[PDB]
Design a protein around this motif. Structure first.
Motif, PDB file in Angstrom:
ATOM      1  N   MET A 182       0.141 -23.969  56.351  1.00 42.70           N
ATOM      2  CA  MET A 182       0.568 -23.585  55.009  1.00 42.70           C
ATOM      3  C   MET A 182       1.771 -24.433  54.625  1.00 42.70           C
ATOM      4  N   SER A 183       1.580 -25.304  53.639  1.00 44.52           N
ATOM      5  CA  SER A 183       2.621 -26.189  53.147  1.00 44.52           C
ATOM      6  C   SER A 183       3.837 -25.372  52.667  1.00 44.52           C
ATOM      7  N   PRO A 184       5.072 -25.849  52.938  1.00 47.55           N
ATOM      8  CA  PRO A 184       6.258 -25.129  52.432  1.00 47.55           C
ATOM      9  C   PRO A 184       6.309 -25.094  50.912  1.00 47.55           C
ATOM     10  N   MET A 185       6.353 -23.892  50.347  1.00 47.46           N
ATOM     11  CA  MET A 185       6.367 -23.707  48.892  1.00 47.46           C
ATOM     12  C   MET A 185       7.404 -22.668  48.472  1.00 47.46           C
ATOM     13  N   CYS A 186       8.426 -23.117  47.744  1.00 45.68           N
ATOM     14  CA  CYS A 186       9.453 -22.218  47.175  1.00 45.68           C
ATOM     15  C   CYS A 186       8.835 -21.097  46.365  1.00 45.68           C
ATOM     16  N   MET A 187       9.337 -19.880  46.565  1.00 47.30           N
ATOM     17  CA  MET A 187       8.826 -18.709  45.850  1.00 47.30           C
ATOM     18  C   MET A 187       9.824 -18.177  44.823  1.00 47.30           C
ATOM     19  N   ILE A 194      10.018 -23.246  59.945  1.00 48.37           N
ATOM     20  CA  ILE A 194      10.986 -23.174  58.867  1.00 48.37           C
ATOM     21  C   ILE A 194      11.367 -24.582  58.390  1.00 48.37           C
ATOM     22  N   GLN A 195      11.344 -24.773  57.076  1.00 48.63           N
ATOM     23  CA  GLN A 195      11.812 -25.994  56.464  1.00 48.63           C
ATOM     24  C   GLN A 195      13.297 -25.895  56.151  1.00 48.63           C
ATOM     25  N   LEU A 196      14.108 -26.534  56.997  1.00 46.84           N
ATOM     26  CA  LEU A 196      15.534 -26.639  56.756  1.00 46.84           C
ATOM     27  C   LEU A 196      15.782 -27.661  55.658  1.00 46.84           C
ATOM     28  N   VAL A 208       9.396 -33.662  60.570  1.00 48.34           N
ATOM     29  CA  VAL A 208      10.199 -34.200  59.469  1.00 48.34           C
ATOM     30  C   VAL A 208       9.279 -34.435  58.278  1.00 48.34           C
ATOM     31  N   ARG A 209       9.595 -33.850  57.129  1.00 46.02           N
ATOM     32  CA  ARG A 209       8.840 -34.138  55.896  1.00 46.02           C
ATOM     33  C   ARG A 209       9.513 -35.284  55.149  1.00 46.02           C
ATOM     34  N   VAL A 210       8.711 -36.290  54.789  1.00 43.57           N
ATOM     35  CA  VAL A 210       9.186 -37.482  54.138  1.00 43.57           C
ATOM     36  C   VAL A 210       8.408 -37.731  52.856  1.00 43.57           C
ATOM     37  N   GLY A 256      -1.769 -32.648  49.755  1.00 40.45           N
ATOM     38  CA  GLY A 256      -1.831 -33.040  48.362  1.00 40.45           C
ATOM     39  C   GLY A 256      -3.215 -32.972  47.749  1.00 40.45           C
ATOM     40  N   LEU A 257      -3.425 -31.904  46.978  1.00 37.19           N
ATOM     41  CA  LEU A 257      -4.662 -31.674  46.227  1.00 37.19           C
ATOM     42  C   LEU A 257      -5.915 -31.567  47.122  1.00 37.19           C
ATOM     43  N   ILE A 258      -5.717 -31.156  48.368  1.00 34.23           N
ATOM     44  CA  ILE A 258      -6.803 -30.826  49.284  1.00 34.23           C
ATOM     45  C   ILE A 258      -7.166 -29.355  49.116  1.00 34.23           C
TER      46      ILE A 258
END
Ligand SMILES: Cc1cc2nc3c(=O)[nH]c(=O)nc-3n(C[C@H](O)[C@H](O)[C@H](O)COP(=O)(O)O)c2cc1C
Ligand SMILES: Cc1cc2nc3c(=O)[nH]c(=O)nc-3n(C[C@H](O)[C@H](O)[C@H](O)COP(=O)(O)O)c2cc1C
Ligand SMILES: Cc1cc2nc3c(=O)[nH]c(=O)nc-3n(C[C@H](O)[C@H](O)[C@H](O)COP(=O)(O)O)c2cc1C
Ligand SMILES: Cc1cc2nc3c(=O)[nH]c(=O)nc-3n(C[C@H](O)[C@H](O)[C@H](O)COP(=O)(O)O)c2cc1C
Lengths: 335, 335, 334, 335
Positions: C20-25, C98-100, C214-216, C283-285
């Motif tokens: 599950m991609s990190p998504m702000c709520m 967790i996405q820091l 690491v997300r880039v 991305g759009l998958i």
């Protein structure tokens, strides 16, 4: 699935409960002749597993066409060409039906000899119809008979009389369009006379072991017109002469109605129960789920699909549970 | 869609016509307490747009559980925990209902006091039930009353009495399971007595401006048992005291029945029309198409989904035609 | 399905290849605290069978939030509340990540101390960021470490450093936003310095047997900005210290981007092959079919779903071929 | 959608990026003649909106058939009947291609003269092929030329040379099946000689303004056989003489291959990029999503659908966003 159960009517066995609803394709010549477009169009749904393919409104007289690109069966030369449709559909596993039709005042060919029970236009864009004499009515009854004779020669399994959608027979049936004061008007028995004579004449020209269907509009959605109670009375007049009622609604005059999946199913069930006759249901049915509900709850004996079979010709194949039910050529594509 | 039309019952407005059918989760402790699993489970369908969430069978006595992992409302301690389910579902836009239940002879707990109207097993895998005295019947009636009182304190909007699926009240209603010769048996009025007493006691303990539903089994599918005619008579006895009949079938004894989409819809429509009372339909309904047909053809007032909402919790959101109908947090995921 | 093959990363085993991609709520209060909304939200996808649930951007400083309704992990009081998310997700079968994060110049809180590598706005609607000193950069590095320490205390399985989407670390990485002339700018090695320091400080505060992602953003879609070749260089600098690159693109500045299913997959594949490191594609998958192709053609090691999991939380359950793979409560619905 | 963008190749414009992959239907006579089953089969997918319909493997001589129900194009009688397929498909908006084939050692007809480059069986169930002389090879080259001449007379828009799937040309290309020590074997340039000669002879017989495709197997999945690098070498030998490589894999020998959606797409992309030539991708592609990804990420220029178009012939229509894109007869079915 219950949809996969056969239905035998007289000597004809329909292999499943799906009928392709009759749908005009406006692709014939002005002489009413089919062409390779029709042959492929119908064959595709036979390939796709449809139990009963009902051919589009096929005019019993040239003035009974809706448009001048409609199919015809008003002459003997049309038989050899229509037979091509019949043969390929039967070869690919379908029962073949023909909807015998007469557009009456809703003939939309401006140069044709437009006729009706009373001199009232279908709408402003239409030609004023000539009010038919009793003599002329007899000749149109004869024309339905000759069309049934030709249909049998072409090899159709089932004949349907198109008594719906605002066309000639419906125009006699509805008080809104039939203002006659002779034996074809005023009383409900008189308004039914034309339909009854057409059925009788078709039976004279149709093998006794092949079924006759009648398509009806069960509601005009207008005060003083046909409603379900009126249609029940009409069906009771003809049920001993026909095999199944193909139940629709509307078409006589423009009316805004509530459209939703199964909006004509209550009419089919009401006729089936009150008249004790087989019926077909049609109208915005697209899912296997609703088709199964209709059949299993005994609301109708067949389910007709129109627009869904235009967009999704192999609908029936997708309901099969084994690859051996598919055309051998397509077995490898079973999922 | 017609599905999106609100339904007001007393002072409670259900925002749409979809009910989450009561479904046991077998996830409580032996104390009958809910836990985080239940809170998330129900909250998920509130987020998913369900109009009325009907909580699973919640036992009004410990001996009225089906299993010792069922929810309970037989003591005051359970109220504080059930309120957590109510609050989160209401916070997320749903109306919250509770199914008040008593399993009677179908209670599966080895160490419980399994009771029924008559000493007859539900089937050869069940315990012989203990035949209730009239005094004991009054105590269970009282227990349903106390359960409703507790449900109101927990903040539920709707109470449903579970009189179906072969459980205690259904056992009193059916001649196949009720062989009593006192005032609770041997006539249709006597067999209805327990249900009527339960409803009256619930009303004593339930605010007049909140709805009462009753779930019934309209058919036992067995000669001598409940059939639609008998259930119409029962509903006529209670219709001035309750607001909606949640119409189901079966459960009393093992019977092989034909299962298909909408297999209980005709009972729902028949009760609605013959008794002039609101009804909900349930049973193998999974498509928006069939749900819409049911509502539009006036076959029921609510459509209940069970298994579809287990596999597809956001079913309602998928029916919306605008992004602003979605939870704000998920707006970016709209078509 | 290849989708159902486990992936072991250090001592953590992810039961399938769906993240599950990190998504702000945008559902926390101004204290950065989660609530029952977050708990249900993440638990739902754990019940839905997702292998790895990556929690939304969680700010390592209050000035590192995007909005004042973001989750935070900048103080010890947040740990016991975040733990509620972790525990319920792991209880329901998911690996928890967790996405820091630190929003840098894209912090949208009017009253916050908005900071950046250079005093250049992200766009017309944004605040001019305050140019960080070297001491302040070290303080933010320290903040990432403390956040990682808190994350381990809360029980997270995986930590992801958010170095993408135009936020603080990305701002240091891109020449378009980093005009510094000290040791944090003006060469590729200097532009990478902040990221490398953050990674090192996270490693000092994160168990060596738990993964670091690491997300880039592998492309700025602008001349003078980050491109795939530059990102390959950056990844080669850090690959001995992290376990998987979560590959995305964009966000630094407004740009027109051609959008279609799998539009960032080529970046994921290129980093995977050219750096010999595990990657995730996003991305759009939306389909099982495309997810399977990506995995089986070795274009990525994980497939991340964002919006599809918002609208279709039980997506993974629908890919199972037996009822035994379903939660026991829902087996009847198979 | 990107899949709706036309692709012009020489003087032929394909209206979209979807090709119907060549699929044997095993429905011809032992004389290799098509019949109404073929005409309807292909026409259906033309109606369904497919940009380029590639007809199934059509044998350039009778011993080049896979089965004795394959189509052939070794005589004029076959041309006359094949023209009926071409005409109806073109009339309905498709570009019509023909796959010119020779089964070589995988000819599965018990009574045929089975030939190959070397005397090695394709598998235990197959016949031992007889080793062709250089004179016989020249005659088969001439057969491909005459077939192209005939294909042009039938009106096909595109000719495809079938150099894949373990058939004759592939057998010459793979070191695993080609053990010749003459000018048709050993060195890679010698292994390519037959393919090169076939392309040259087709060109002598095929209008310069019509496209030539070549279908290849880019991997034998076996040490010593064809791999992507070897196929890149072969394509570099022919790329100035042909327009598009239709990229597949396998078929030479039985090998347990990992099958999944897009399993052959990497071969199509690699040939496209390394050879600077157009390619088509094929293999377990069924979704609009994956089709769009393939085209948008520049992995191929066309997407070929096989089995999906057998079960879902109107796949392309379902991708259209406007009713005006549908055949006029079916525009009422746009939803
Ligand atoms: C293109 C088209 C042509 C039609 N032509 C006929 C016809 O010849 N005869 C007829 O009885 N109904 C005709 N109708 C009505 C359909 O047969 C069917 O009754 C109606 O569309 C409702 O079914 P559906 O919702 O499944 O399409 C036609 C409908 C369409 C869309
Ligand atoms: C796991 C499960 C639990 C159920 N528990 C209850 C229950 O507590 N009360 C009830 O009235 N029906 C119960 N039922 C029946 C459902 O509410 C519903 O009436 C039935 O499943 C038919 O609807 P469906 O086809 O939509 O699932 C249960 C069904 C399932 C599958
Ligand atoms: C509501 C929403 C919130 C997002 N918040 C984050 C975030 O906190 N961290 C992040 O890296 N990406 C965030 N993004 C990006 C997504 O994680 C994902 O990379 C992007 O939506 C593309 O994937 P998708 O097409 O599957 O949605 C967010 C996207 C959305 C729609
Ligand atoms: C019934 C059938 C017949 C086939 N015949 C041919 C053929 O004549 N020529 C060819 O190149 N491939 C043939 N193949 C292979 C297909 O064209 C296609 O390459 C393969 O099935 C992978 O595509 P798909 O997964 O879309 O079906 C055939 C496949 C099937 C299923």
């Amino acid at each position: 699935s219950i949809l996969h159960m056969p239905l035998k009517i007289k000597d004809i066995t329909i292999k499943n409960r799906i009928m392709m609803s009759p749908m005009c394709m406006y692709s014939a010549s002005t002489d009413g002749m089919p062409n390779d477009w029709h042959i492929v169009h119908y064959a595709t749904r036979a390939i796709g597993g449809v139990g009963l393919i009902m051919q589009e409104a096929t005019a019993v007289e040239s003035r009974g066409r809706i448009t001048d690109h409609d199919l015809g069966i008003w002459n003997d030369e049309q038989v050899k060409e229509l037979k091509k449709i019949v043969d390929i559909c039967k070869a690919n596993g379908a029962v073949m039906g023909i909807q015998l039709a007469h557009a009456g005042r809703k003939c939309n060919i401006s140069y044709e000899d437009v006729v009706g029970p009373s001199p009232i236009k279908a709408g402003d864009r239409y030609k004023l119809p000539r009010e038919l004499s009793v003599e002329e009515i007899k000749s149109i009854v004869k024309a339905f008979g000759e069309a049934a004779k030709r249909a049998n020669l072409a090899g159709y399994d089932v004949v349907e009389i198109h008594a719906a959608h605002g066309y000639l027979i419906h125009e006699f049936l509805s008080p809104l369009s039939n203002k006659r004061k002779d034996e074809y008007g005023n009383s409900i028995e008189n308004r039914a006379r034309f339909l009854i004579e057409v059925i009788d004449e078709v039976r004279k020209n149709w093998p006794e072991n092949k079924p006759i269907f009648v398509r009806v509009s069960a509601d005009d959605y207008m005060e003083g017109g046909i409603n379900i109670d009126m249609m029940v009375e009409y069906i009771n007049m003809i049920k001993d002469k026909v095999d199944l009622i193909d139940v629709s609604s509307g078409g006589l005059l423009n009316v805004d109605i509530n459209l939703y999946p199964g909006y004509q199913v209550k009419y089919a069930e009401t006729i089936k129960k009150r008249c004790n006759i087989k019926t077909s249901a049609v109208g915005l049915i697209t899912t296997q789920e609703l088709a199964e509900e209709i059949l299993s709850n005994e609301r109708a004996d067949l389910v007709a699909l129109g627009r869904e079979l235009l967009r999704n010709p192999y609908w029936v194949l997708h309901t099969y549970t084994s690859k051996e039910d598919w055309p051998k050529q397509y077995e490898r594509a079973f999922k």
